[PDB]
Design an enzyme around this catalytic site. Structure first.
Site, PDB file in Angstrom:
ATOM      1  N   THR B   1       0.857  -1.217   0.000  1.00 48.94           N
ATOM      2  CA  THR B   1       0.000   0.000   0.000  1.00 48.94           C
ATOM      3  C   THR B   1       0.874   1.241   0.000  1.00 48.94           C
ATOM      4  O   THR B   1       2.081   1.155  -0.203  1.00 48.94           O
ATOM      5  CB  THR B   1      -0.936   0.039   1.221  1.00 48.94           C
ATOM      6  OG1 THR B   1      -0.160   0.073   2.424  1.00 48.94           O
ATOM      7  CG2 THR B   1      -1.832  -1.188   1.244  1.00 48.94           C
ATOM      8  N   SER B   2       0.260   2.400   0.216  1.00 52.27           N
ATOM      9  CA  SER B   2       0.994   3.651   0.349  1.00 52.27           C
ATOM     10  C   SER B   2       0.117   4.644   1.089  1.00 52.27           C
ATOM     11  O   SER B   2      -0.789   5.232   0.494  1.00 52.27           O
ATOM     12  CB  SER B   2       1.398   4.200  -1.019  1.00 52.27           C
ATOM     13  OG  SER B   2       1.843   5.536  -0.914  1.00 52.27           O
ATOM     14  N   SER B 129       3.991  -0.342   1.596  1.00 51.63           N
ATOM     15  CA  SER B 129       5.032  -0.866   0.720  1.00 51.63           C
ATOM     16  C   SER B 129       5.545   0.210  -0.228  1.00 51.63           C
ATOM     17  O   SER B 129       6.747   0.291  -0.502  1.00 51.63           O
ATOM     18  CB  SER B 129       4.498  -2.065  -0.062  1.00 51.63           C
ATOM     19  OG  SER B 129       3.316  -1.728  -0.760  1.00 51.63           O
ATOM     20  N   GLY B 130       4.645   1.045  -0.743  1.00 58.04           N
ATOM     21  CA  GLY B 130       5.031   2.065  -1.699  1.00 58.04           C
ATOM     22  C   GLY B 130       5.738   3.256  -1.099  1.00 58.04           C
ATOM     23  O   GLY B 130       6.245   4.092  -1.852  1.00 58.04           O
TER      24      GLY B 130
END
Lengths: 244, 196, 220, 239, 231, 204, 243, 250, 194
Positions: B1-2, B129-130
């Site tokens: 995600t981010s 994650s981003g």
């Protein structure tokens, strides 16, 4: 009213819980303690009767601190007050652990009120024989509260309990009349000593030691500290001077 | 995600993408990762979806119970409630949280609660994650007390690159602006941020 | 399994196939995969057949009791909360992947709950082995402001894509349409595209073909 | 709370359990139940106490209960208390079958309930069960057996016994007419004759009667008579 | 009266009779005297025997090298309280490597004794204790009561006829509080004080018991021939 | 390793014209070793028949459980348990131990005494109600039975014709399963009577 | 033995005396209150008696904000009132957590009334000597008044009054509803409903009121709030303006 | 602090009577009258709604409640006890029967569970008996329409027609004259209203009276379509308009 | 590990190996792997080192407690049903009893011998002849060939000699012979010349 007063949870035909009313009679026998709310904090004072010369001065402290910003003073059955304050310390620590902030005084007062009230629900337990004047300074000002054996509590500009409560309440009322703008913390300490000395006139049969405590934003940086040394002696001198 | 949270002059902005993936498959491409735990306290969820949703539900229940009894909580209190759940169950709940909120006294506050369960107060926070692909960009470009327009432009540039380089991040950009004026929700579609 | 939910302009429609498999074998060719949680809240479950049937039956019981307690029509949100909290409590051991859809006094709702207790809101959803095949149809053809007929066709068409393209999905299409103003209509076996053809020969044995050791009459 | 405790489980100054004596007095006001053990079966008969033209006699089964395919009980006293014990008896009978794969012996089932009744009589501070039972059953060991138990937890085996109201009169009548070599059909008469004499109403009618029998395919059957069946025998017996 | 049947009943005047009766048990016990200077604390206990064929029941109990107590009233209750005090002193050492402060030790007894005076089922401890100890704050002496009240004192006496010894200590307060670094002179002061509580008997080698704790003195009990020189 | 395959055995249920058929093999073994040729796997609780396959200890345990439960049901209800009600009783009982499950596949068969229509239902080891209008199979040879029953079965078979179909499906499926055989028993359940038949089959 | 009057068990007449005495405990504060329903709001007016000069009037409140939407005014001793308020606050939060939506006022009255019944059956627990009046504007039922009593009884109300002079207030409300022939006060804003409620409290009690004599709670859509002394003063000024 | 009433407060008196049960039954006798009538094709349970105050919305307080879609109950005695007791009955109808057998319990078994709950309060420690008598009307496919009365003691009996509460003696005498084994449900409602009209002292209209029936299945109340085996609730409340219409023809 | 049982017309014959082996060596060569549950019921057992005797003695206490309590001897069917239940309870317990038992008894009311084979899972089956573990791999082929229901005790013993000889010939382990006990109408006795 007899018959209905042998148990703690029983309503009398009038709805009065007599055992809680008898617990109040225990409070009225205790030494007078007062609390004065100043414009930036609270001041606590308690009369400590000197039963005999063999009591070491300044060691039998009767004002108690909860966490670091709440101070508790009570009259009646001293062991009951310590039991209640021990719970408050557990309630205060639990609040701080979960919410990370010191427990607000209105929040703390409710925690104690629920505990004191819970002792009037069941006949297997006894009501608290103490009225606790407690308060302190939190994020949104100073607060002063007063519990009763029934669990009732309200916020007070100035609270008094114990045997000299009727005398003390008269001078507390005068303070609010003379100082509606708000009394200063240092002047409240001097006035607190004067009130206790005047209230002691109901206990002239025995000597007493004045113990003062207070929690002001400006002077203690919001923490609860005792009056000691020079400041205490000025209050004692002022109280004696007004008496004389 | 981010997920991302940026304090600015008038308050704090929470932002996140909308993609949730189960492997390469995008299970839902329009997810709403901004969760309201209180009126002016919102949190961003990263990591296990089940754990973060469970924690957010419990935290909301605690802050709701706090408000009825002790008045409105501060963002620090909300992060504290998050810490207890994330820390006391750190072996089970794999949850990384960003808590942002607004109150009049402290203005906007941001608290990040990484996988370990520690709490860190920050001017801006990025997770998911981003986020790894925009650590350099955000650090070079973030400024204290930017306006709402500058912060939104800053966030759009930041997430567009996080979305660009991360397979597990993408979709629409959802923002929540917490200020004295209230809560404002913004959405930016790929046609808006992709060609920045 | 193939399950889809499609929210349209005045309600929500959920559809599912009717094939149940035990590995590569088709145990039940006409399993009913759409389950009631309440009259106007319905659930469709993928994954383990027992848990989906059992979890919905437990939540359906609590929804009815809570509805009787509060004297109110159940909220789809109440089913979602009790359903996800139950699944989370078991840490994913209850392998029930569910699409819960329904209509309550607050409108039409469509959620999916995963075995671990995570939930998501959506306008069209899919679960099961045929989810990717079904979601291809939903992505291609879904649009805002679908009518009841367009949604039913889209939901059935999405299920058919899973039926034809997924080995774990087949047989028939079950459809339930829940519209805000009226009752939920359960269209059992809405489409039956896989009706078996006539056998080439009849295998009626002549009586007496089987050898028997003893015969008995059993008392009831 | 100590002041409100009645001290259920205590001895009287003369070595009697007060609440058990009072529980027995309660049972003496309940409808009479009679059990007669015949050479070829057992007859359980009981008299309904509550009766009205608007009461549904067809399905009002309140004194005769089935514990097993082989055992039945007639109840006198608090109907609510009995059903609590009836269900534990049924569960125990099935637990024994589940464990030993055989039908529970009648005495073992009676002993278990009497142990449950005795428990309330010695510990726990709760009031005793105000119910007396007449167990009628069959097993391979002793054949047809007829037991009775009371709130005290004591149980005894009988050839003919009555519990409830007018036990003294009912027992005296049974003493006069009970013959050891009598058949069930004679026990059908004796049970009805005894009830018709000890009944507190003007006359005995089918609406007031619960009636059941246990008799021998060579396998023991239980028949709890339906109202028309009871009406038939009342005419045959001449009542 | 019917307000004294249990410990959870207030009387119409606010008095807890069951606690008052527990306090009456102490007044039946033999006199034990406690006093202290700034450097040393001393316990003097009169011991009593059922018969002249019996040994004199012990009155002083040791809780640490730095703490101890004398008892008056129900001796079995003293064992319950003294054991609890040892555990609290034990807990402080193991968990903090810190000698339990005498004041803090007294408050722990106050909290334990109070619990029996507010909930049904238990009874107040019918024993009064004089706790002496030395810690980083100096010598201390505490008087514990069944009600839970704990008082820190220069000197005191509990038990039958304790008023005579208590009155003597008040007159001598200005004197024995100045006996620093002279242990044996405090013991003489305490023995002279307890001698004011004797009605029809005189202190003897087996009757008397003494204990002392101070800056360098660990808590030691003098019984039998050890107290021969103080009588 | 697999508890359901230790003892073998198979059960098949078929529906006809106002009649039900349930059949099973009589083999009990310990993997390769055949222990008993009289281990019946079909139990009746009134007019409802339950065939349980799988681990032989669980088959025996569930028989005494459902006898315990159905016996108490008839005492409280004063009527025998119907096939539809019993199907849910079995389903709930198997799910009550989702995490301690019995390694058994049961097969319910019976005729509703009131409506009079045939009923058969199947299950997994944790209680998924597989209600089928045509036939139900269970056991080690379920693969063989499915293909064997799927081809031979036709709707509305008379009780005499149903016996040939179910028996032939069972014998031929059992013959191709190593852990099934050693005789078979067929129940032909009709609204008015039940016929129990033992089949001649290979004893290897 | 006179057990029947000391614990919640039946007396020979079939009465639970301890529950009857708990009703007497409700009037011991000598505080009157009434609740009325507007078109889209519910208003609770309660007397605020602070005879002691040392009290802080800000804390002398008998109206509790149970939830964002639910409010409660209690009649009876404050220690019991706060006990019910804390339990109600816990119940409302738990309901929202378990069932995903805000607890309706009627469900909270039922939940709190079921608790009061338990105290009335268990001998261990005494009844609370309080009467709880829950007010809100339900998402489905609109404005709602639900009053619970120590016996475990509760019911919805068009308008309700409580306290020693409950009968006097109720007749005034009864007459007004009789003449208007409607089930609610027909005003579009809560300021007019508050002025209406205060006017009949003044008329029913026949006493002039100052800003410190009243404590007012207003339940609207998605919010329940209590008026401050300055806000109440504005309403009193409007009443003195005859409009 | 702990619960110290582990002893039974209901005990046998020297005369054999259980004092608390008798007093619990007295509270029912001063309760508001309620009655039930069993017809050939349904059951009707009726009661009057006496309001605490004219400002109370009596529609919010239902004296007749649904236990299962086919079973309904009405009470006489203490209202709060019925409310908690109904909550228990609905719960046990699911936990004990439906969650096991997949179908709702028959009236006889649900009445047994309710009776077990009342009996437990009559012997368990530190509790008083429920001060309510219930008239539980229901239907099941095997026993048909049935009407039961459950007493504070936990004893329950089946009735063709019965009345409990203040006017039970007069109502039961009236019901005996009127009831017969040929009644239809429409006639039972007529007899129920006539019997109730005698008991009521104040206004007698649809707002002061509450009726419910167990009759034909109502598929329009089922809430969904597509499952033929689901036919709808048999328990139905008659709205005030429905009762008022029948009063005009009374 | 050898546990054999053969039911003949008038009695039940149970044979069990005498050897006890713990790791590297044979500790004992005269062990009795049987417990008399009742005057006419005998139980042979085999399995894990400690479980076999702990279970067998625990079962024997309950059967003895029942016999004293009701003054009645449980039938072999009831004893086997009781024993199976305990094994079934244990197989899914914290520490299962890994014990395989043969229960041979004489039913004095049906006047018929009864042999029941129950394995550690709780699989009760009544057989004319039984064996546990690999002991049945070598013996069933002989018993299937020679067994007849109407054998006398002497013929049954002669058949056990053949079964034991085959076990001695082909089974790798040395089980130090067998102890043979016969459950008859007269009770339980041991054959010493076997």
């Amino acid at each position: 009213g007899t018959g209905y007063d042998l148990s703690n949870s029983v309503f009398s035909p009038d709805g009065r819980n007599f055992q809680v009313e008898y617990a109040v009679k225990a409070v009225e026998n205790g030494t007078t303690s007062i609390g004065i709310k100043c414009n930036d904090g609270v001041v606590f004072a308690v009369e400590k009767l000197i039963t005999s010369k063999l009591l070491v001065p300044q060691k039998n402290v009767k004002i108690q601190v909860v966490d670091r910003h709440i101070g508790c003073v009570y009259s009646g059955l001293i062991p009951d007050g310590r039991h209640l304050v021990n719970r408050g310390r557990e309630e205060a620590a639990s609040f701080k652990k979960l919410y990370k902030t010191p427990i607000p005084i209105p929040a703390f007062a409710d925690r104690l009120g629920q505990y004191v009230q819970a002792h009037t629900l069941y006949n297997s337990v006894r009501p608290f024989g103490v009225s606790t004047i407690f308060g302190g300074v939190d994020k949104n000002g100073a607060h002063l509260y007063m519990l009763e054996p029934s669990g009732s509590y309200w916020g007070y500009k100035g609270a008094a309990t114990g045997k000299g409560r009727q005398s003390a309440k008269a001078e507390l009322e005068k303070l609010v009349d003379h100082h509606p703008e708000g009394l200063s913390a240092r002047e409240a300490v001097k006035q607190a000593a004067k009130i206790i000395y005047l209230a002691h006139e109901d206990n002239k049969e025995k000597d007493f030691e004045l113990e003062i405590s207070w929690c002001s934003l400006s002077e203690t940086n919001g923490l609860h500290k005792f009056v000691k040394g020079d400041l205490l002696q000025e209050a004692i001198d002022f109280a004696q001077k007004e008496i004389n | 995600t981010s997920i991302m949270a940026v304090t600015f002059k008038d308050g704090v902005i929470l932002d996140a993408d909308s993609r949730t993936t189960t492997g390469a498959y995008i299970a839902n491409r329009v997810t709403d990762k901004l969760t309201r735990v209180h009126d002016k306290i919102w949190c961003c969820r990263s990591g296990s979806a089940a754990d973060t949703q469970a924690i957010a539900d419990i935290v909301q229940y605690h802050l709701e119970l706090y408000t009825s009894q002790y008045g409105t909580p501060s963002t620090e209190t909300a992060a504290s409630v998050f810490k207890e759940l994330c820390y006391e169950n750190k072996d089970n709940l794999t949850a990384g949280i960003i808590v942002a909120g607004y109150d009049d006294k402290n203005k906007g506050e941001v608290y990040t609660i990484p996988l370990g369960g520690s709490v860190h107060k920050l001017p801006y926070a990025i997770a998911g994650s981003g986020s790894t692909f925009i650590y350099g960009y955000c650090d070079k470009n973030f400024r204290e007390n930017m306006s709402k327009e500058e912060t939104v432009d800053f966030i759009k540039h930041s997430l567009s690159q996080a979305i660009k380089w991360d397979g597990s991040s993408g979709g629409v950009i959802r923002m929540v602006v917490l200020t004295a004026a209230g809560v404002e929700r913004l959405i930016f579609y790929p046609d808006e941020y992709e060609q920045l | 399994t193939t399950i889809v939910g499609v929210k349209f302009n005045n309600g929500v429609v959920i559809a599912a196939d009717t094939r149940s498999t035990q590995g590569p074998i088709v145990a039940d060719k006409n399993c009913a995969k759409l389950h009631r949680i309440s009259p106007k809240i319905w659930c469709a479950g993928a994954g383990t057949a027992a848990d989906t049937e059992a979890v919905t039956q437990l939540i359906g019981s609590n929804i009815e009791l809570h509805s009787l307690y509060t004297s109110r029509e159940p909220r789809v949100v109440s089913a979602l909360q009790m359903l996800k909290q139950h699944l989370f409590k078991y840490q994913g051991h209850i392998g029930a992947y569910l699409i819960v859809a329904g209509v309550d006094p607050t409108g039409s709702h469509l959620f999916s709950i995963h075995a671990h207790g995570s939930t998501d809101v959506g306008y069209y959803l899919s679960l099961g082995s045929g989810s990717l095949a079904a979601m291809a149809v939903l992505e291609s053809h879904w649009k805002q402001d679908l009518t009841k007929e367009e949604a039913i066709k889209l939901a059935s068409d999405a299920i058919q894509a899973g039926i034809w393209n997924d080995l774990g999905s087949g047989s028939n299409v079950d459809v339930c349409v829940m519209e805000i103003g009226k009752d939920a209509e359960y269209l059992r076996n809405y489409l039956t595209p896989n009706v078996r053809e006539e056998k080439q020969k009849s295998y009626k044995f002549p009586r007496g073909t089987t050898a028997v050791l003893k015969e008995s009459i059993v008392n009831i | 709370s100590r002041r409100y405790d009645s001290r259920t489980t205590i001895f009287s100054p003369e070595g009697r359990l007060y609440q058990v004596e009072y529980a027995l007095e309660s049972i003496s006001h309940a409808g009479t139940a009679i059990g007669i053990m015949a050479s070829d079966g057992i007859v359980l008969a009981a008299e309904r106490k509550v009766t009205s033209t608007l009461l549904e006699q067809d399905t009002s089964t309140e004194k005769l209960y089935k514990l097993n395919d082989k055992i039945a009980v007639a109840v006198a006293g608090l109907t609510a208390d009995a059903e609590i014990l009836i269900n534990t008896a049924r569960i125990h009978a099935q637990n024994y079958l589940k464990t030993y794969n055989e039908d529970i012996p009648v005495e073992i089932l009676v002993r278990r309930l009497s142990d449950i009744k005795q428990g309330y009589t010695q510990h726990g501070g709760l009031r005793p069960f105000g119910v007396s039972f007449i167990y009628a059953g069959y097993d391979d060991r002793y054949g047809y057996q007829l037991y009775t138990s009371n709130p005290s937890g004591n149980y005894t085996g009988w050839k003919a016994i009555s519990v409830g109201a007018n036990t003294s009169a009912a027992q005296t009548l049974l003493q006069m007419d009970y013959k050891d070599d009598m058949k069930v059909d004679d026990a059908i008469e004796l049970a009805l004759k005894t009830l018709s004499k000890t009944t507190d109403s003007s006359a005995l009618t089918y609406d007031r009667l619960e009636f059941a029998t246990i008799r021998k395919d060579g396998e023991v059957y239980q028949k709890i008579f339906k109202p028309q069946e009871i009406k038939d025998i009342l005419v045959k017996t001449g009542i | 009266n019917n307000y004294d049947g249990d410990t959870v009943t207030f009387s119409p005047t606010g008095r807890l009779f069951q606690v008052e009766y527990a306090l009456e048990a102490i007044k039946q016990g033999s006199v034990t005297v406690g006093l202290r200077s700034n450097t040393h604390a001393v316990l003097v206990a009169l011991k009593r025997n059922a018969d002249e064929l019996s040994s004199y029941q012990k009155k002083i109990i040791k809780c640490d090298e730095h703490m101890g107590l004398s008892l008056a009233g129900l001796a079995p209750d003293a064992r319950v309280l003294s054991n609890y005090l040892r555990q609290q002193c034990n807990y402080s050492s193991l968990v903090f490597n810190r000698k339990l402060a005498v004041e803090r030790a007294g408050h722990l007894l106050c909290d334990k004794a109070q619990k029996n005076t507010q909930s049904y089922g238990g009874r107040p401890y019918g024993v009064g204790l004089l706790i002496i100890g030395y810690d980083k704050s100096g010598a201390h002496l505490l008087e514990f009561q069944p009600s839970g009240n704990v008082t820190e004192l220069y000197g005191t006496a509990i038990g039958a006829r304790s008023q005579g010894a208590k009155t003597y200590l008040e007159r001598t307060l200005d004197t024995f509080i100045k006996i620093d670094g002279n242990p044996d002179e405090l013991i003489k002061a305490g023995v002279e004080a307890i001698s004011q509580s004797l009605r029809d008997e005189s202190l003897t080698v087996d009757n008397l018991s003494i204990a002392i704790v101070g800056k360098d003195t660990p808590f030691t009990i003098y019984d039998g021939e050890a107290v021969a020189k103080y009588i | 390793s697999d508890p359901s395959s230790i003892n073998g055995g198979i059960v098949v249920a078929m529906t006809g014209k106002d009649c039900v058929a349930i059949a099973c093999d009589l083999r009990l073994g310990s993997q390769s070793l055949g222990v008993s040729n009289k281990f019946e796997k079909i139990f009746h609780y009134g007019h409802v028949f339950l065939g349980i396959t799988g681990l032989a200890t669980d088959v025996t345990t569930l028989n005494e459980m459902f006898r315990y439960k159905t016996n108490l049901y008839k005492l409280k209800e004063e009527r025998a348990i119907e096939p539809e009600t019993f199907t849910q009783l079995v389903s709930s009982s198997l799910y009550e131990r989702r995490f301690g499950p019995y390694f058994v596949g049961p097969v319910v068969a019976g005729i509703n005494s009131k409506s009079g229509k045939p009923f058969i239902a199947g299950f997994d080891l944790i209680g998924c109600i597989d209600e089928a209008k045509d036939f139900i199979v269970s056991g080690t040879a379920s693969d063989q039975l499915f293909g064997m029953c799927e081809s031979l079965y036709e709707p509305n078979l008379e009780p005499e014709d149903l016996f040939e179909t179910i028996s032939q499906a069972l014998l031929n499926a059992a013959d191709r399963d190593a852990l099934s055989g050693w005789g078979a028993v067929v129940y032909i359940i009709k609204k008015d009577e039940v016929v129990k038949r033992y089949l001649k089959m290979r004893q290897d | 033995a006179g057990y029947d009057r000391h614990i919640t068990i039946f007396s020979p007449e079939g009465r639970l005396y301890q529950v009857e005495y708990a009703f007497k405990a409700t009037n011991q504060t000598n505080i009157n209150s009434l609740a009325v329903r507007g078109k889209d709001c519910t208003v609770v007016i309660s007397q605020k008696k602070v005879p002691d000069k040392l009290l802080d009037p800000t804390t002398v409140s008998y109206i509790f904000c149970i939830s964002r939407t639910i409010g409660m005014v209690v009649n009876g001793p404050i220690p019991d009132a706060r006990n019910a308020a804390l339990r109600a606050k816990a119940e409302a939060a738990e309901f929202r957590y378990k069932y995903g939506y805000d607890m309706p006022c009627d469900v909270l009255a039922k939940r709190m009334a079921n608790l009061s019944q338990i105290y009335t059956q268990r001998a261990y627990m005494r009844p609370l000597g309080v009467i709880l009046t829950f007010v809100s504007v339900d998402e489905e039922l609109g404005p709602s008044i639900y009053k619970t009593d120590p016996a475990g009884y509760y019911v919805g109300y068009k308008a309700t009054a409580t306290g020693p002079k409950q009968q006097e207030i109720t007749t005034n409300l009864e007459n007004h509803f009789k003449k208007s022939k409607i089930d609610h006060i027909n005003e579009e804003s809560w300021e007019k409903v508050v002025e209406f409620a205060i006017t009949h409290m003044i008329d029913a009690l026949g006493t002039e009121f100052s800003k410190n004599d009243l404590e007012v709670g207003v339940a609207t859509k998605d919010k329940f709030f209590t008026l401050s002394a300055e806000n109440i003063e504005e309403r009193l000024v409007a009443i003195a303006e005859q409009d | 602090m702990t619960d110290r009433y582990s002893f039974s407060l209901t005990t046998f008196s020297p005369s054999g009577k259980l004092g608390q049960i008798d007093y619990a039954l007295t509270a029912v006798k001063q309760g508001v009258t309620s009655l039930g009538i069993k017809a050939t094709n349904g059951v009707v349970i009726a009661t009057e709604k006496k309001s605490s105050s004219p400002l109370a919305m009596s529609e919010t307080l239902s004296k007749v409640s649904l236990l299962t879609p086919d079973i309904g109950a009405v009470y006489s005695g203490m209202g709060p006890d019925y409310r908690v007791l109904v909550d228990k009955s609905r719960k046990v109808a699911h936990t004990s029967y439906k969650r096991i057998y997949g179908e709702y319990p028959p009236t006889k078994l649900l009445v047994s569970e309710v009776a077990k709950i009342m009996q437990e309060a009559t012997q368990s420690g530190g509790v008083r008996p429920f001060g309510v008598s219930l008239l539980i009307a229901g239907h099941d496919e095997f026993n048909g329409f049935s009407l039961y009365q459950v007493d504070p003691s936990g004893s329950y009996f089946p009735w063709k027609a019965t009345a409990i509460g203040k006017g039970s003696v007069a109502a039961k005498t009236f019901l005996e004259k009127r009831w017969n084994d040929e009644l239809e449900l429409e006639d039972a409602i007529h007899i129920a209203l006539l019997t109730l009209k005698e008991s009521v002292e104040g206004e007698f209209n649809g707002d002061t009276i509450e009726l419910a029936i167990i009759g034909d299945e109502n598929p329009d109340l089922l809430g969904y379509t597509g499952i033929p085996t689901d036919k709808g609730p048999r328990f139905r409340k008659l709205t005030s308009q429905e009762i008022n219409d029948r009063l005009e023809a009374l | 590990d050898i546990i054999l049982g053969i039911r003949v017309q008038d009695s039940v014959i149970l044979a069990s190996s005498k050897a006890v082996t713990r790791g590297i060596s044979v500790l004992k060569d005269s062990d009795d792997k049987t417990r008399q549950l009742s005057p006419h019921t005998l139980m042979s057992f085999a399995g894990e080192a400690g479980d076999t005797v702990q279970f067998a003695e625990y079962i024997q206490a309950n059967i003895q407690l029942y016999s004293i309590r009701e003054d009645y001897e449980l039938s072999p069917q009831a004893v086997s049903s009781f024993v199976r239940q305990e094994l079934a309870k244990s197989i899914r317990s914290r520490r299962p009893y890994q014990v395989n038992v043969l229960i041979g008894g004489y039913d004095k009311k049906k006047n018929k011998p009864e042999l029941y084979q129950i394995d550690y899972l709780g699989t009760k089956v009544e057989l004319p002849y039984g064996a546990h573990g690999y002991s049945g791999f070598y013996t069933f082929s002989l018993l299937d060939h020679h067994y007849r229901p109407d054998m006398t005790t002497e013929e049954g013993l002669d058949l056990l000699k053949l079964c034991v000889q085959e076990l001695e010939k082909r089974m790798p382990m040395d089980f130090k012979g067998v102890i043979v006990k016969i459950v008859d109408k007269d009770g339980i006795r041991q054959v010493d010349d076997f």
